[PDB]
Amino acid sequence: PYEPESGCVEIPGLSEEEDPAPSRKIHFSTAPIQVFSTYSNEDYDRRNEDVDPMAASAEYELEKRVERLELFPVELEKDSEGLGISIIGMGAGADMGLEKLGIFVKTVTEGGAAHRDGRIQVNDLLVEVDGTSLVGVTQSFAASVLRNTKGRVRFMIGRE
Amino acid sequence: XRXXX
């Protein structure tokens, strides 16, 4: 049942300024300054706790490397054995820890769906699976996305 | 956080 409200208050204007140049074309009002009312902080929460420049920068450094790689779509039938790949997370640089990783194919299981297909090799980068980005993710988030896949699974793969 | 917060 929100009722917005508007108002104006005048305050003292710009002080007179003596000796400005006669060559100066612009001038400044001495009239009262109108102060218009906007929302309180109670009405309008302007805070945004979701900005995190350290996390974003870490993702961005990873993203920068990926788009030097040529990207290509792969589609696999997920059978009973699974996808026939294992994965490894690697950071964008030395000893980055666990949070913002690129997800590479470490293993391509012989006889498995990825192998029978031919297009996916060890060291390929999994950029996207099931429409979900895997660029700058944890290895557990990646694993979860992969296990949750069913039927014909759509990939974007990077290499080189 | 200076880039400016």
Partner: protein
Amino acid sequence: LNLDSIIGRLLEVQGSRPGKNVQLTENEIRGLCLKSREIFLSQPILLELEAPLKICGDIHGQYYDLLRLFEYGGFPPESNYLFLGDYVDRGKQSLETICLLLAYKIKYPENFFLLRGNHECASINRIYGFYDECKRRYNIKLWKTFTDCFNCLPIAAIVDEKIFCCHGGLSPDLQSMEQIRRIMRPTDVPDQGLLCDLLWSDPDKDVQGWGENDRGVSFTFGAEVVAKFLHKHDLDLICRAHQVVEDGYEFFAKRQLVTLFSAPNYCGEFDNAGAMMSVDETLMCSFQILKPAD
């Protein structure tokens, strides 16, 4: 394109509790980005404008504050507007903010103007919230579309051959307006040089000449750099944004420079007002203030 429908839906939340989203379709937002980009490229990179005009500083996705600014200043086309950049990042509603502004640029291209701020730059808005908002509400491809658009924004404006406007400030390298005019778009913002400085530099009352900038890029300039520039180019005033100022405006170097900031209580961590500067036909300058209620 559906422009009036888009505008209608963006304005529909005027009477709502602030924070309520307007979720346009992806195709709609793509169309605004592509149309406005053509317009920006067809107009000069150094805009040459005539009074009357209202000039606003940073918005930073504070959509409901932008709506108030138009309510009090007059919705386009009642007033002509020049915005000085920083439409996105920090706020929760960068998308609404930039879409409404692009829509007005498209509908009223000769009476509504937008300059590039340091946050209209992929390497900055990746980090300070805009990419996150695009990723959350749309997809990252849409963030890339906005980048292509922002890469075509003009960089500076001269109002009636007397007021030089840009987001940040001066450059030690700026000696001729032709240096701005010859910049080709689309372009990214470099981490050094003329374009960088115009978007990043700050006045400093404690420096004489040119100093190092606390931000880690570009420079600070003193009051005599301002006086010299104005005298050399037969200009009266530098109008810039980029720094939160408690009253929404703040003069520097007597009244040779003004800073405008138009996002009140900025990202809920400052208690500033927002302000706009009106310039009338006789070149009288006045200030209107947007102050949060207590």
